[PDB]
């Protein structure tokens, strides 16, 4: 009988056309890896994101269970690096470490103990 503080969604991502690398730059992500032999290997990932441009004023969407009286919170996605065949800004193709989303975590923005 437990519950998530941030609602996440997990699945196959076949539409990731770009990603940020180890160095913080943006690289393009190829759809297929030329594997030695007959058919090319397909490049796709498995990622976890947040289930979270909304009416003005409104907002105030924090994490479930955080003391709204002490904290301003927000569910944000977390990254992990995976190796992927990609192309950089100048065209060089190659294997680089890229950030994909592997979780939806709660972030505390400001305040504390009834300040």
């Amino acid at each position: 009988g437990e519950l998530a503080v941030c609602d996440a969604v997990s699945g196959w991502v076949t539409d990731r056309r770009t990603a940020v690398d180890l160095r913080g730059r943006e690289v393009e992500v190829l759809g297929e890896v030329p594997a030695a032999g007959g058919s090319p290997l397909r490049q796709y990932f498995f990622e976890t994101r947040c289930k979270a441009e909304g009416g003005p004023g409104a907002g105030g969407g924090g994490c479930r269970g955080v003391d709204r009286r002490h904290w301003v919170s927000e569910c944000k996605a977390k990254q992990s690096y995976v190796r992927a065949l990609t192309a950089d800004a100048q065209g060089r193709v190659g294997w680089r470490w890229i950030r994909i989303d592997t979780a939806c975590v709660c972030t505390l923005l400001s305040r504390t103990g009834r300040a």
Partner: protein, 109 residues
Amino acid sequence: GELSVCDSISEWVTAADKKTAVDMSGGTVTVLEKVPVSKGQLKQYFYETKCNPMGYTKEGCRGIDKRHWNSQCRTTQSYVRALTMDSKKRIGWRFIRIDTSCVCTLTIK
């Protein structure tokens, strides 16, 4: 920079330190040391993130409303593709599960 409800640590794990792993279908596979690429070979490393055992959120996650809930920071897994070899010696790219986050979970009392 950012402040999470749960403390976590991350590290580059070598294939040698993760020689066998469980794949999507629930099977055990052997993770290879090197992945062949045209022009050479790359070493297989994994980037894992788990709850920090030397941190401040062992008792409960930060900022939770103690008046209505209990909390717990737990390491969660996710699938990452790797060049593996199954029990029948077949070499192939499979999705194995590795530690990727440390998330909070609410519980009553």
